[PDB]
Design a protein around this nucleic acid. Structure first.
Ligand code: MG
Ligand code: MG
Ligand code: MG
Ligand code: MG
Ligand code: MG
Ligand code: MG
Ligand code: MG
Ligand code: MG
Ligand code: MG
Ligand code: MG
Ligand code: MG
Ligand code: MG
Ligand code: MG
Lengths: 129, 83, 129, 218, 71, 208, 23, 98
RNA sequence: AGACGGACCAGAGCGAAAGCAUUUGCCAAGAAUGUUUUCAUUAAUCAAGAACGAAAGUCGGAGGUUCGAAGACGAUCAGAUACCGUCGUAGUUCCGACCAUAAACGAUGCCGACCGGCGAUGCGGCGGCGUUAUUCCCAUGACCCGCCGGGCAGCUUCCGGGAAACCAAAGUCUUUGGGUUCCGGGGGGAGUAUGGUUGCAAAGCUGAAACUUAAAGGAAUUGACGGAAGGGCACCACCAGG
């Protein structure tokens, strides 16, 4: 069973983009994805996305422009404590320049840089580059 | 690539594809740029201006170079609506 | 108890014809002499065997071309029969037999030209598995 | 002296092409080591790595042949690898030097933290494989030096890399695969797509196409 | 596969415990059987008395006599 | 590329396509050759659209015209059918032909006898002439083909839906292709009809 | 062969149980 | 090393199958192994045909046939020179000869 | 009189697996499809524990054609308490209780998603030219032509992996984390000794240590060999003969 709504979508983004597609459809269409996608788009890694509505979970479509390498997820949602960022981000990322670990927190869903500029930690969700 | 003095390093910048935004390597011997001619709009007769379309190996091996170029052309004020 | 010719014998027989097809004829003892006169072989017996294959070979050249022997006279008679054109073949009879499905495509392609359509039939198609 | 058999050789014998970068920009195969000795001449040093005596049985007795491994580079961003086997070890060594010049590549370099000076290490971490061995290259600050076994250390200096870490997996004690993996690694640096890239291309004129005139025998 | 939860620690910690005994060195050390059966009581050296002098033969591809003593 | 312009299917070429059966494919269909289809009739013979097959024929020509030295181009037909058309197509634009028994290694193996490094490759059949399509992967070459509805489409960049079985259709398609490349570049006017006949490219079986 | 190595043992293991049941 | 993918027997999705017995060997083998063969031979075999049909009582007497189903072992077959070993790539043909 | 249910029998179906084949009648269950019915998160996997479990085997009755461990003979053999041939006990058959093992193999845990094509086959539903059907035209299969679901399999490929053989899963794995269960850690000693537990017995489950040893092993390659097969060859081989 589908005990996790975010894990599957990023896989189905990653595989398609690893192939050479231009669009994809991912089904369950939940709130937390929307934030996750918004922050990717904001930094520029993807295009727009149109979210189909039905009186159910919903559905959704994205446009890629596949300049993305891998999109990832970390489960279980661990708990960060604002001194361990360095130890997480050196051994998940390829370098100290680019790549973003995204985390939920009391202020919202944000990347790690913004968390440090606001001086707050939270719980970890995934990562992309 | 730039230093903190706006310079340029990385002795060249590798040509990307146009159809997947994937990079072409120094040993990808199944890559092509492809020229195509433009006309005078009254009587054929190529006049001197041509374009360029670049393809990588993976697309050319899958069997999808045909439509990629086609939809590249279908946008560029070149092959019209087939309908 | 067997008699096969080797590469040296055969190849020279080929080259001799491909130069001197006019000197030679269908008689062995003349073909023998001319080969002596043009070419300088070290041995009387090698002289013999070459000519014997030459003469066998001429009788083939009389009718039917051969793989590795390009002769002028044959090659122009080819060339005539290559440039041969008929008077008319693509103007078939001023009636073109056509089917309804084409006529729909033609109609969509804006043509009400001269054509025909007289076909209906049940489906048979494939063969016995 | 040397006569070019083909187009590309005829041009480099002339002064039309100026460098090697353009050749790589269009991914053109090269099949003549006389070219490499033209552009890269005397800035290029070589060394053998191992000589491995394989052999085979037949009806009479074993027949042995000597195989050879060679690495070549200039310490400014080029590196080559070559292999070959034959009966005489000198002829073995000679030919593999030719293949090594031939299958030469570029190698990209970048910074760790802040961008002051020239690059000293790799931009991003990469990997490679060949048959039960995997290798992983990692950036480092400016001064650590390379930490690895001797084999890739001999090879990474030839690229002109200054500092790096290193890790490995599998049966490292087969040198042939252990060598080619780290070479696969530093080959695929100009294939990783960063945000430094993502600017459109300014397509150039394909040297065969622009110098058509001189080629058609004038 | 692997358990991999957020509150699974008792299971994993347990699993490593009972499954570590299947290693030869750990098992040898942390059980007293090799220790109480070692002639040296967990020690390096030891003094003792001679009572014979014999010669031990060697393995196949070599051939010699190695001049040992019963102690 | 057939844009909206003077060049477009008038009334005469259509009569020719219909005459030679250049709109009937085979029965079986590839998933790559399924956008160049109009319909399937009662019998399993599919109808090809004579709008896209003319709007890609131009595109192949515009590729060739880009290449100013014609002798770099090469044309292949190993099969008996397209033999004659190719030799006249070579003559009528200055290409370099290869007919029958393509020997492997001709584009590799610099020290071979018949070595040659071209820039563009034209073909009658991809399923029979499947070596050079391969050997154009060890060497950068753009690749053009004449392909039927059932045709494994690989390593190729410009497909022209035809009926590559019938002698009439094959040599006909070359006649058109030779015609445009000269119109686009040369003395042919594009108005008044070109002299030679499209029967010159047929394959004549030894009947008389 | 292993079927017979298995079978030789049972024949023995009976003799041990039989011998040991006397006491 | 799987020499075959079928494992030599055309089971594919049962669990169990009945056995049969070799016609020569007399041994117990499944029905999906155990090469099959079918005989439609005549009774007189191409030699005495003229003699009978001239010494008959009827008029040309169409002369019936004889029908048999045969089962063979794998071992007994190869010794009978029915089938033969093959090379690696040619093992993968499921076609009988003409 | 007692067993067995041929050919039709298929890389076809059903079942949790073991396994299931003559006709008819009865008894109670089930998958898939169809659904603008209903309840409203009720679920996935699972220590302890519980049902089922080929053949052999054990227990008590009935029955006992055929085959046949043991067993006795005749042959071959240097010897054969084996391969072969003739006889022939337990058993093989049914009713009722025990035991709980197998190359019990897809040698491949269950759930869920994603990832390329092609032609078929079996069930159900939806459609369409036409042929028959039948007895005057319809709803039944049968084909003809397609579609959709969830099934047993198959061919093809630089998807991608892998020590390779190979595999649309053994893929989406140094760019390492979907959820969870059981289990392995050089080779032998050894599934042995002992202790506990079940069982009528045979045996099953749990399960060591001293000592010994530097290699055991997997996939593929080149030779050699073969009382393995297909082509040829020689009086230092044969046939016929001196
Ligand atoms: Mg250890
Ligand atoms: Mg079974
Ligand atoms: Mg249990
Ligand atoms: Mg039983
Ligand atoms: Mg029984
Ligand atoms: Mg009884
Ligand atoms: Mg008997
Ligand atoms: Mg078991
Ligand atoms: Mg098992
Ligand atoms: Mg594996
Ligand atoms: Mg892991
Ligand atoms: Mg062990
Ligand atoms: Mg084993």
């Amino acid at each position: 069973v589908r005990m996790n709504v975010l894990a599957d979508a990023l896989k189905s983004i990653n595989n398609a983009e690893k192939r050479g597609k231009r669009q994809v459809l991912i089904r369950p269409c939940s709130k937390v994805i929307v934030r996750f996608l918004t922050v990717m788009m904001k930094h520029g890694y993807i295009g727009e996305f149109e979210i189909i509505d039905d009186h159910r979970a919903g559905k959704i479509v994205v446009n890629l422009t596949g300049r993305l390498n891998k999109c990832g997820v970390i489960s279980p949602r661990f708990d960060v404590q604002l001194k361990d960022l360095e130890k997480w981000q050196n051994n998940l990322l390829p370098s100290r320049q680019f790549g973003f670990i995204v985390l939920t927190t009391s202020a919202g869903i944000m990347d790690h840089e913004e968390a440090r500029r606001k001086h707050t930690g939270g719980k970890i969700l995934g990562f992309f580059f | 690539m730039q230093n903190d003095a706006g310079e340029f390093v990385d002795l060249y910048v590798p040509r990307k594809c146009s159809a997947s935004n994937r990079i072409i390597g120094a040993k990808d011997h199944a890559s092509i740029p492809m020229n195509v001619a433009e006309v005078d709009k009254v009587t054929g007769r190529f006049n001197g201006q041509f374009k360029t379309y670049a393809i990588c190996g993976a697309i050319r091996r899958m069997g999808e170079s045909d439509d990629s170029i086609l939809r590249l052309a279908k946008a560029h004020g070149i092959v019209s609506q087939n309908f | 108890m067997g008699r096969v010719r080797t590469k040296t014998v055969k190849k020279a027989a080929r080259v001799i014809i491909e130069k001197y097809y006019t000197r030679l004829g269908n008689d062995f003892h003349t073909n023998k002499r001319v080969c002596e006169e043009i070419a300088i072989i070290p041995s009387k017996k090698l002289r013999n065997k070459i000519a014997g294959y030459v003469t066998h070979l001429m009788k083939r050249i009389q009718r039917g071309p051969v793989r590795g022997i390009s002769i002028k006279l044959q090659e122009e008679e080819r060339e005539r029969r290559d440039n041969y054109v008929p008077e008319v073949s693509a103007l078939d009879q001023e009636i073109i037999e056509v089917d309804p499905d084409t006529k729909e495509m033609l109609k969509l392609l804006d043509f009400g030209s001269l054509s025909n359509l007289q076909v209906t039939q049940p489906t048979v198609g494939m063969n016995f598995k | 002296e040397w006569l070019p058999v083909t187009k590309l050789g005829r041009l480099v014998k002339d002064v039309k092409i100026k460098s090697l970068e353009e050749i790589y920009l269009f991914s053109l195969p090269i099949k003549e080591s006389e070219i490499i000795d033209f552009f890269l001449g005397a800035a290029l040093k070589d060394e053998v790595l191992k000589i491995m005596p394989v052999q085979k049985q037949t009806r009479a007795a074993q027949r042995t042949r000597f195989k050879a491994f060679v690495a070549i580079g200039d310490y400014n961003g080029h590196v080559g690898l070559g292999v070959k086997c034959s009966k005489e070890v000198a002829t073995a060594i000679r030919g593999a030097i030719i293949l090594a010049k031939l299958s030469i590549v570029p190698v990209r370099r970048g910074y760790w933290g802040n961008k002051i000076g020239k690059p000293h290490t790799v931009p991003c971490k990469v990997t490679g494989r060949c048959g039960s061995v995997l290798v992983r290259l990692i950036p480092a600050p400016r001064g650590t030096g390379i930490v690895s076994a001797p084999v890739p250390k001999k090879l990474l200096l030839m690229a002109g890399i200054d500092d790096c870490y290193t890790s490995a997996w599998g049966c490292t004690a087969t040198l042939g695969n252990f060598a080619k993996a780290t070479f696969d690694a530093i080959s695929k640096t100009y294939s990783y797509l960063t945000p430094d890239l993502w600017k459109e291309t300014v397509f150039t004129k394909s040297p065969y196409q622009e110098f058509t005139d001189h080629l058609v025998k004038t | 596969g692997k358990c991999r939860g957020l509150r699974t620690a008792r299971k994993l910690r347990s699993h490593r415990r009972d499954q570590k005994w299947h290693d030869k060195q750990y098992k040898k050390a942390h059980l007293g059987t090799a220790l109480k059966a070692n002639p040296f009581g967990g020690a390096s050296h030891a003094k003792g008395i001679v009572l014979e002098k014999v010669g031990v033969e060697a393995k196949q591809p070599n051939s010699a006599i190695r001049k040992c003593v019963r102690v | 590329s057939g844009a909206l312009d003077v060049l477009q299917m008038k009334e005469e070429d259509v009569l020719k396509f219909l005459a030679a059966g250049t709109h009937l494919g085979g029965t079986n269909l590839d998933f790559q050759m399924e956008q160049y289809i109009y319909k399937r009739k009662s019998d399993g013979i599919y109808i090809i659209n004579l709008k896209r097959t003319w709007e890609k024929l131009l595109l192949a020509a515009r590729a060739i015209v880009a290449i100013e030295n014609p002798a770099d181009v090469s044309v292949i037909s190993s099969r008996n059918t397209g033999q004659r058309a190719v030799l006249k197509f070579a003559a009528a634009t200055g290409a370099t032909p290869i007919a029958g028994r393509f020997t492997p290694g001709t584009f590799t193996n610099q020290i071979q006898a018949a070595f040659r490094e071209p820039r563009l490759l034209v073909v009658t059949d991809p399923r029979a002439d499947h070596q050079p399509l391969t050997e154009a992967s060890y060497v950068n070459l753009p690749t053009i083909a004449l392909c039927n509805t059932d045709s494994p489409l690989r390593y190729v960049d410009i497909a022209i839906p035809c009926n590559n079985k019938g002698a009439h259709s094959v040599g006909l398609m070359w006649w058109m292709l030779a015609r445009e490349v000269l119109r686009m570049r040369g003395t042919i006017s594009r108005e008044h009809p070109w002299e030679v006949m499209p029967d010159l490219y047929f394959y004549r079986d030894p009947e008389e | 062969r292993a079927k017979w190595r298995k079978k030789r043992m049972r024949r023995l293991k009976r003799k041990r149980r039989k011998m040991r049941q006397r006491s | 090393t799987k020499k075959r993918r079928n494992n030599g027997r055309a089971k594919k999705g049962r669990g169990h199958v009945q056995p049969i017995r070799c016609t020569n060997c007399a041994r117990c083998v499944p029905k999906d192994k155990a090469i099959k063969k079918f005989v439609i031979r005549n009774i007189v075999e191409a030699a005495a045909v003229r003699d009978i049909s001239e010494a008959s009582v009827f008029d040309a007497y169409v002369l019936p046939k004889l029908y048999v189903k045969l089962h063979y072992c794998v071992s007994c077959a190869i010794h009978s020179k029915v089938v033969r070993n093959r090379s690696r790539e040619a093992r993968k043909d499921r076609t009988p000869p003409p």
